[PDB]
Amino acid sequence: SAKDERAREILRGFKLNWMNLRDAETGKILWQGTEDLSVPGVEHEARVPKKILKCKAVSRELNFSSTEQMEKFRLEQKVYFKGQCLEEWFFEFGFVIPNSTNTWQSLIEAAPESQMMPASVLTGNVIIETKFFDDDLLVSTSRVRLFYV
Ligand code: NI
């Protein structure tokens, strides 16, 4: 076999079960998703309350299942607005026990420049690109268009 086939094994056995965003200031739920937004090769949509834009810090929980072991599960997220990369995020989970279900908690501190951009301009015009890696092995690329309601 090969690295390309190993990545497909991990991808085949991977699932995002649920995700939520909390206002880190209060711990109150902003947003809750149950769609597997890790599914690649298509565009997804997420409808998020516009109040998220005025949060200095959001607490994300991603709950995921992996049939395959991963040595160093990490994410690279790029926020695109009108073709322009506004923000770059790097998150690391680390070691994933095979046949495990895990909650990955991340504090996400938005650029202050992003906090004052109007919801009416961002809505429908923002793509989050997520690259799922095992160390340097790219497992999948997923795309979610954001609406701020
Ligand atoms: Ni081989």
Author numbering: 2 to 150
Authors' description from the paper:
PDE6D has been reported to chaperone NRAS, HRAS, and KRAS4B but not KRAS4A. We determined the direct target of DW0254 to be PDE6D, a chaperone protein that facilitates cytoplasmic trafficking of farnesylated molecules, including RAS, as a target for this compound, thus linking RAS transport with RAC GTPase activation in leukemic cells. The results presented here provide evidence of the importance of PDE6D in sustaining downstream RAS signaling and cell survival in a large panel of acute leukemia cell lines.
E Docking results in wild type apo structure of PDE6D and R48delV49del mutant; Root mean square deviation (RMSD) with respect to 3D coordinates of the ligands in the superposed X-ray complex of the wild type protein are reported. In addition, in silico docking of DW0254 to R48del V49del PDE6D confirmed an accentuated increase in the root mean square deviation (RMSD) in contrast with Deltarasin’s RMSD that was only marginally affected, strongly suggesting DW0254 would be unlikely to bind PDE6D in the event of deletion of these two residues. Interestingly, the combination of DW0254 and Deltarasin had a significant synergistic effect suggesting that these compounds might be targeting singular conformations of PDE6D with different efficiencies. Indeed, large conformational changes in PDE6D to facilitate the binding of farnesylated RAS proteins deeper within the hydrophobic pocket have been previously described.
